Ligand binder design. Structure first.
Ligand code: WGL
Ligand code: WGL
Length: 134
């Protein structure tokens, strides 16, 4: 058993704010922003030993990352950036940093009440996305 337990399960998007703006900041093109912004993903978090898996399933894309906390990995994002990612647990929050082309973005995932809150930041543009158990 582990503190990451609080994240495990199947989650459904219930609200999004400022995500088109965040995606613009990151450099996502118009057509991708439109189609990804329409997506209503289900997000499946699981843990097997030290390996955490986060899967997103939507009509836009079905993606998945697996990782060990603190240990860099290379990720291809749904908008086709090739980034170096590191995810750590800080004070109960999963902190995901992606670095590419001298740029960086941080994605925080946290449990608040019965929700899983996703906060995405690029420069000083923040987007908040709220998920509930499916
Ligand atoms: C735009 C949909 S993708 C997505 N959306 C979210 O709001 C949270 C989340 O973590 N993901 C992905 C990221 C890549 C790994 C699998 C999950
Ligand atoms: C909520 C995290 S956003 C995110 N995280 C990733 O780890 C991969 C990825 O592809 N994305 C975005 C990128 C913009 C297009 C929509 C998905």
């Amino acid at each position: 058993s582990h503190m990451c337990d609080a994240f495990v399960g199947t989650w459904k998007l219930v609200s999004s704010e400022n995500f088109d703006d965040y995606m613009k900041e990151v450099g996502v093109g118009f057509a991708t922003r439109k189609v990804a912004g329409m997506a209503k993903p289900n997000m499946i978090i699981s843990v097997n030993g030290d390996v955490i898996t986060i899967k997103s399933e939507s009509t836009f894309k079905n993606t998945e990352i697996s990782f060990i906390l603190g240990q860099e990995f290379d990720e291809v994002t749904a908008d086709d950036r090739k980034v170096k990612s590191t995810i750590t647990l800080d004070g109960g929050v999963l902190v995901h940093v992606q670095k590419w082309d001298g740029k960086s973005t941080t994605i925080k995932r946290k449990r608040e009440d019965d929700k899983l809150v996703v906060e995405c930041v690029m420069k000083g543009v923040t987007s908040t996305r709220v998920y509930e158990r499916a």
